[PDB]
Every structure is written in C-alpha cells, then in structure tokens.
C-alpha cells in the first residue's frame, strides 16, 4: 500500500524504478574529486609559472 | 507514522538519512558550470588557432 | 492526501517542488561522459609520449 521503507545508512541515493540508488554511481565516484578538484589544482602550478610570463615583457 | 513533509522551495535535493539535502553540495556548485562549461569554452579559442595548423601544411 | 504516485520508467530523477525531475538535466547529460571520460582519455595519449621524456634524460 505504502512504498517508503525509511532506509537510514548516512549514504545518499536517488529515486529510480521505485528503488533507492547511490547517485555516486552516476556522478562517477572518485569522491567526485576527479571532476572538481583537478581544475582547482591546475591553476596553482600554472600560476607559479607567471614569473616567466612578465619576465619577457619587463625584459 | 508518515515521513514526507512536502517541502516546496523550487530548490532540488536528495534522500539522505531521512533528510532532504541539496545535491548541489555534492555536485560541487559553480552552477556546475565549472565541470561542463569550461570544456565547451576550450574548443572555441583552440579552434580559431587552426588557421595556423593548415598554414604549415599548405605552405 | 498522499504525494507519491510510484512512477516506474527505469529513468532516475530528484525531488524538486514536489516533482520528479531527471537529475541528468542538472548533471549536464553527455552520458556524463564529457565530465569523467575525457580525463581518463588524456592520460592515455599523454602517457605514450613519455618515450620522449626519458629520451632526453638518458641521452
């Protein structure tokens, strides 16, 4: 009569065919770090190489 | 007895430990623009530099 | 009185304003391949170019 079961495991999931499924499997796991976190990293090493960018300009 | 509250705020959220939580916090916000939208941008400037790619080939 | 309808289509969706909405539209579709799958690809061609990296070092 009622569909909810109230599943509590601290885990996150979506509504699919009347089933609770970890969205992470469709997000692509990696903590999701591999989508977001790399972009943040690139700037950091790339930015320290600017000392060479103005070097040409100033001299 | 019943778990649903019917929360309406135009916002989107997932089922976690019996709580409605904004999936955006796990998507990584930025509108999500910073995952998708950059990829689309790279092509654009990179593509305008093709005039130099055939230049070598043709001459 | 009750909000659930039990929609079964094998498709996945989130809870928004009391409506079932395909999270894919907010994920950015592409199978999501275009967020995850490219990163995996870059390594592959980039890694085959290492034969040139040690070449300088060894000679």
* CATH code, domain carrying B56: 1.10.287.210
- Among C14, C15, C25, most B C-beta atoms within 10 A, so best to mutate, is C15
Distance spanning both ends of chain B, measured CA to CA: 78
Classify burial at C24, counting beta carbons within 10 Å of its beta carbon; exposed 0-12, middle 13-18, buried 19 or more. middle
User: Domain containing A39: what range?
Assistant: 1-59
Tokens for A25? Answer: 């499997």
CA distance A5 to A19: 10
The answer to whether residues B15 and A22 touch, using CB atoms and an 8 Å cutoff, is: no
Q: Looking at the partner chain, which of B15, B23, B35 has a beta carbon nearest the beta carbon of A20?
A: B15
Short-list C28, C34, C11, C40, CA closest to B24: C28
- Among B34, B36, B37, most C C-beta atoms within 10 A, so best to mutate, is B36
The answer to whether residues A20 and A12 touch, using CB atoms and an 8 Å cutoff, is: no
The answer to whether residues C25 and C11 touch, using CB atoms and an 8 Å cutoff, is: no
Which residues contact residue C35 at a Cβ distance below 8 angstroms, ignoring those fewer than 6 apart?
A28, A35, B35, B36, B39, C27, C28
Which segments within C1-59 are labelled E, that is strand?
12-16, 19-21
**Experimental determination technique:** NMR
The vertex-B37 CA angle with B34 and B12, nearest 5°, equals: 65
Short-list C26, A22, C38, CA closest to B28: C26
CA distance B16 to B22: 10
The number of distinct structural domains making up chain A is 1
Chain B residues 2-41 with a CB less than 8 Å from chain A: 3-4, 14-18, 21, 23, 26-28, 34-35, 38
DSSP assignment, residue B1?
A: -
Q: Tell me the chain A residues in contact with residue B21 when contact means C-beta distances shorter than 8 Å.
A: 12
């Amino acid at each position: 009569g009622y569909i909810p079961e109230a599943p509590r495991d601290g885990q996150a999931y979506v509504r699919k065919d009347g089933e609770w499924v970890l969205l992470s499997t469709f997000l692509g796991s990696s903590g999701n770090e591999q989508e977001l976190l790399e972009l943040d990293k690139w700037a950091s090493l790339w930015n320290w190489f600017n000392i060479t960018n103005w070097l040409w300009y100033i001299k």
